[PDB]
Amino acid sequence: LLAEPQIAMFCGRLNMHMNVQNGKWDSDPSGTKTCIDTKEGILQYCQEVYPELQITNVVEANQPVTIQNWCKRGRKQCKTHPHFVIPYRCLVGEFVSDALLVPDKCKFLHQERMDVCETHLHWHTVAKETCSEKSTNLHDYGMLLPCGIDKFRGVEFVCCPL
């Protein structure tokens, strides 16, 4: 969901966050906060930047975005080269899994491993690998059953014809 709460980082520039009202990337309120290394720190920035929301978890978005107007410290020189970055989604309150679009001719699948607690990458790879086994393409996917910070017990996905 391209306009939901989320943050985007580019080291050397101020963090961006999604403006849910207009869909645009807004720079850091303080004019000082830059890129973060830990998922836990990303959760903390989510919480700081969306004070009216209860941020309970985070997850990688599935596709990178392009952002060109990164600000330097103190919010000026807010132009640089276009930069590809995968935003982190700031997940709100009780977990609701993504409603995936399933084009005609494609197939919705889901797998749950209630005995494991796994990464976004792992589930992405499970999804992709499943589709590939039948000569189809992974089209859209989402996490299921959070069990930790950016850790989940399952994946929902859509496989489409090549």
Curated annotation (Swiss-Prot):
Site positions for Required for Cu(2+) reduction:
M143
Outcome following mutation: H120N: Binds copper. Forms dimer
Q: What is the effect of changing H120Y?
A: Greatly reduced copper-mediated low-density lipoprotein oxidation
What is known to happen upon mutating H120A?
Answer: Some decrease in copper reducing activity
Region called GFLD subdomain, residue ranges: 1-96
Kindly list the positions annotated as binding heparin. Answer: 69-83
**Outcome recorded upon mutating H124N:** Binds copper. Forms dimer
Residues annotated for Cu(2+) 1 binding in this entry? H120, H124, Y141
Relate the outcome reported for changing C117S: Binds copper. No dimer formation. No copper reducing activity
Q: Which residues form the E1 domain?
A: 1-162
Cite the effect that the entry attributes to H124A: Loss of a copper binding site
Where do the annotations place Zn(2+) 1 binding?
E156, C159, C160
**What cystine pairs are annotated?**
C11-C35, C46-C90, C71-C78, C106-C160, C117-C147, C131-C159
Question: Where is region (CuBD subdomain) located?
Answer: 104-162
The molecule here is called: N-APP
Q: Which lineage ranks, top first, belong to the organism behind this chain? A: Eukaryota, Metazoa, Chordata, Craniata, Vertebrata
